[PDB]
Amino acid sequence: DPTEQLAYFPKITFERLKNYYAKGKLTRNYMILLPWQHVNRYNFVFSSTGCKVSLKTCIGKLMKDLNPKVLYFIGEGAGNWMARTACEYPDIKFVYRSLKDDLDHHYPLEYQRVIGELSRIIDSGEGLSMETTDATQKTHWDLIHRVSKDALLITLCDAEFKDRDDFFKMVILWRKHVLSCRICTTYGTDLYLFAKYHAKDCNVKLPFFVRSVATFIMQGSKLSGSECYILLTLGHHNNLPCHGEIQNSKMKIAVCNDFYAAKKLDNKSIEANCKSLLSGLRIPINKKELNRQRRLLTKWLTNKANTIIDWLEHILNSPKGELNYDFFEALENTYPNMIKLIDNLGNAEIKKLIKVTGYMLVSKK
Ligand SMILES: [Zn+2]
């Protein structure tokens, strides 16, 4: 059942800034190296965007008002955001698109493991070329209605654009489509595009007839970043959110709010992330379990293994704290040779380490 499965997803905290004087800067230098935003994502293996952003939480009223039958997703991932959306709205259907590559993801692996069946996905994107899956290409939009004949009411883009102009290329193409499309023009100018954007400069105008409604700053976003989500529509264009706006809102959420843990614990997922971090790791991860992984080793792979145990060992010895960057900074600055950890382990393994670290801290006391 979709609604029962929603309990494995964590509560989202965000800041909404409607686009419709001197506001001093909020600053706090957190001495953190690890990606602590994955601390409440222990229940998800491949993708985990559903823990970062949600439609019922952010655009809940817009979902109720527009009441779409089909939701369009252009996110280059395993479909965890789409998986959460299926749990929130169990009668909604989906059109899925992701850039076709062997390097990255181009199939809903996470949606399939969360929901079970792909029956609700009416357009998996199968049989499409590399450019017909690329949001920055015309032919991608020309083939979006190949199955779904419903208007693009709410289009959701989680694409991570290499170039900042590539975001614009995608936006201009969305505008061109909604103002041309026989289906979409019948629905009117009350069409939306909710997309991930990296705020870098100030007073940067959006393309012609593209108006920003609100800007959402997520707790789940990388602290050191400037990633936000912007709701866009047809109307007299305004400027994109500036780098300053985001940092202050981002800081408040980091300084004040705590990371909410998931109501339920998917043991299958936790077992999977544990074996993916260190093959042989079993739950619960106690002192006896960690001493077993040490004796098993008695080489680069054996050096990488020891680094992992030593960190998980530090978590066991560390007291239970509130899930906030102040406590994560403490955890980091109390563990000696933190630089050895960052040097030995790659970006994916370091994300896997924090998912398991999070499981531990939640399982404490
Ligand atoms: Zn259309």
Short mmCIF file of C-alpha atoms in Angstrom, two decimals, residues 152-314:
data_model
loop_
_atom_site.label_atom_id
_atom_site.label_comp_id
_atom_site.label_asym_id
_atom_site.label_seq_id
_atom_site.Cartn_x
_atom_site.Cartn_y
_atom_site.Cartn_z
CA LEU A 152 1.86 19.60 -18.23
CA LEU A 153 0.14 21.06 -15.09
CA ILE A 154 3.05 20.27 -12.73
CA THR A 155 6.43 19.42 -14.34
CA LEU A 156 9.17 18.44 -11.85
CA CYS A 157 12.84 18.84 -12.78
CA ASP A 158 15.61 17.55 -10.50
CA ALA A 159 18.29 17.68 -13.26
CA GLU A 160 21.76 18.73 -12.08
CA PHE A 161 22.94 21.07 -14.88
CA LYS A 162 26.69 21.08 -15.65
CA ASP A 163 26.39 24.58 -17.21
CA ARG A 164 24.19 27.38 -15.77
CA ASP A 165 23.00 28.29 -19.34
CA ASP A 166 21.80 24.66 -19.74
CA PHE A 167 19.15 25.36 -17.02
CA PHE A 168 17.89 28.28 -19.18
CA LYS A 169 17.94 26.07 -22.35
CA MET A 170 15.58 23.66 -20.47
CA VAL A 171 13.33 26.51 -19.15
CA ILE A 172 13.01 28.24 -22.59
CA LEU A 173 12.12 24.80 -24.06
CA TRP A 174 9.43 24.23 -21.35
CA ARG A 175 7.97 27.71 -22.13
CA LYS A 176 8.13 27.08 -25.92
CA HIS A 177 6.31 23.72 -25.43
CA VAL A 178 3.50 24.93 -23.04
CA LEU A 179 2.79 27.92 -25.37
CA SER A 180 2.83 25.71 -28.56
CA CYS A 181 1.43 22.27 -27.50
CA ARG A 182 -2.14 21.54 -28.66
CA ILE A 183 -2.86 19.85 -25.27
CA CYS A 184 -1.08 22.34 -22.94
CA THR A 185 -2.55 25.48 -24.67
CA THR A 186 -6.09 24.12 -24.02
CA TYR A 187 -5.37 24.19 -20.23
CA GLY A 188 -4.23 27.86 -20.36
CA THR A 189 -1.35 29.79 -18.75
CA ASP A 190 -1.95 28.12 -15.34
CA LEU A 191 0.94 25.65 -15.85
CA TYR A 192 3.90 25.09 -13.50
CA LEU A 193 7.57 23.95 -13.49
CA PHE A 194 9.12 23.14 -10.08
CA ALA A 195 12.88 22.88 -10.62
CA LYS A 196 16.20 22.54 -8.72
CA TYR A 197 18.35 25.69 -9.24
CA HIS A 198 21.79 26.81 -7.94
CA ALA A 199 21.64 30.51 -6.91
CA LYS A 200 24.98 32.15 -7.80
CA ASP A 201 24.50 35.80 -8.87
CA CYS A 202 22.05 38.69 -8.16
CA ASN A 203 19.22 40.39 -10.20
CA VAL A 204 19.40 37.66 -12.94
CA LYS A 205 16.16 37.87 -15.03
CA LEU A 206 14.29 34.69 -16.01
CA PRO A 207 13.44 34.11 -19.75
CA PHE A 208 10.58 36.13 -21.30
CA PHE A 209 7.10 35.29 -19.93
CA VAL A 210 8.55 33.01 -17.15
CA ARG A 211 7.62 34.23 -13.61
CA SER A 212 8.96 32.73 -10.33
CA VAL A 213 6.08 32.14 -7.81
CA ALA A 214 8.12 30.98 -4.73
CA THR A 215 11.62 29.75 -3.78
CA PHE A 216 12.06 26.75 -1.48
CA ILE A 217 15.21 26.24 0.61
CA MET A 218 15.53 22.64 1.88
CA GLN A 219 17.14 21.25 5.08
CA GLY A 220 18.20 18.20 3.00
CA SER A 221 20.33 20.37 0.65
CA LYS A 222 24.17 20.32 0.96
CA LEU A 223 25.08 23.01 3.60
CA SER A 224 28.09 24.35 1.59
CA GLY A 225 25.94 24.60 -1.56
CA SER A 226 23.37 27.15 -2.82
CA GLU A 227 20.82 24.62 -4.21
CA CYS A 228 17.14 25.65 -3.95
CA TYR A 229 13.84 24.72 -5.67
CA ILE A 230 11.89 27.28 -7.66
CA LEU A 231 8.23 27.16 -8.74
CA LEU A 232 7.83 28.86 -12.16
CA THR A 233 4.78 29.82 -14.29
CA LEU A 234 3.71 31.87 -17.35
CA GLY A 235 3.71 35.63 -16.61
CA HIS A 236 5.68 38.92 -16.67
CA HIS A 237 9.26 37.69 -15.87
CA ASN A 238 11.04 38.49 -12.60
CA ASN A 239 14.59 37.79 -11.29
CA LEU A 240 15.84 34.39 -10.08
CA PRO A 241 16.72 34.07 -6.32
CA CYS A 242 20.13 35.51 -5.46
CA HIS A 243 23.02 33.75 -3.65
CA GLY A 244 22.58 35.98 -0.57
CA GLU A 245 18.81 35.25 -0.11
CA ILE A 246 19.46 31.47 -0.03
CA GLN A 247 22.50 31.50 2.36
CA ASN A 248 20.58 33.32 5.15
CA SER A 249 17.48 31.06 4.84
CA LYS A 250 19.85 28.02 4.55
CA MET A 251 21.72 29.14 7.71
CA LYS A 252 18.59 29.55 9.88
CA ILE A 253 17.42 25.98 9.04
CA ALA A 254 20.98 24.69 9.84
CA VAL A 255 21.39 26.68 13.11
CA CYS A 256 17.85 26.12 14.54
CA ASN A 257 16.00 23.05 13.12
CA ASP A 258 16.91 19.41 13.78
CA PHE A 259 16.93 16.56 11.25
CA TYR A 260 13.69 14.54 11.64
CA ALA A 261 14.11 10.75 11.65
CA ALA A 262 11.77 8.32 9.81
CA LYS A 263 8.80 7.00 11.90
CA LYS A 264 9.47 3.41 10.70
CA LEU A 265 12.77 1.58 9.99
CA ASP A 266 13.08 -0.48 6.75
CA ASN A 267 15.47 -3.24 7.99
CA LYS A 268 15.88 -4.58 4.39
CA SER A 269 17.21 -1.14 3.25
CA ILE A 270 19.48 -0.73 6.33
CA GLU A 271 20.90 -4.29 5.82
CA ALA A 272 21.50 -3.31 2.12
CA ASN A 273 23.28 0.02 2.91
CA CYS A 274 25.40 -1.76 5.57
CA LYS A 275 26.56 -4.50 3.13
CA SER A 276 27.14 -1.79 0.45
CA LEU A 277 29.35 0.23 2.88
CA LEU A 278 31.28 -2.81 4.20
CA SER A 279 30.50 -6.29 2.78
CA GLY A 280 29.95 -8.46 5.86
CA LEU A 281 28.38 -5.76 8.09
CA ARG A 282 25.16 -6.94 9.81
CA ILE A 283 22.54 -5.17 11.98
CA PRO A 284 22.56 -4.39 14.95
CA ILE A 285 25.99 -2.72 14.74
CA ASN A 286 27.26 -3.16 18.35
CA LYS A 287 30.78 -3.61 19.90
CA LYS A 288 30.70 -7.42 19.31
CA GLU A 289 29.67 -6.83 15.64
CA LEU A 290 32.56 -4.33 15.05
CA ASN A 291 35.15 -6.65 16.75
CA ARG A 292 33.99 -9.43 14.33
CA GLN A 293 34.77 -7.16 11.29
CA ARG A 294 38.28 -6.48 12.74
CA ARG A 295 39.16 -10.22 13.25
CA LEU A 296 37.79 -10.97 9.72
CA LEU A 297 40.58 -8.80 8.15
CA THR A 298 43.41 -10.51 10.16
CA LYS A 299 46.21 -4.18 1.04
CA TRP A 300 44.18 -1.05 0.00
CA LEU A 301 40.75 -2.74 0.49
CA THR A 302 41.73 -3.85 4.06
CA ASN A 303 42.96 -0.27 4.82
CA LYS A 304 39.62 1.21 3.51
CA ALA A 305 37.77 -1.37 5.70
CA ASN A 306 39.66 -0.36 8.90
CA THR A 307 38.89 3.37 8.30
CA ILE A 308 35.13 2.50 8.21
CA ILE A 309 35.19 0.38 11.44
CA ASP A 310 37.15 3.15 13.30
CA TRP A 311 34.45 5.75 12.42
CA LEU A 312 31.51 3.43 13.36
CA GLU A 313 33.50 2.66 16.57
CA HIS A 314 33.68 6.45 17.30
#
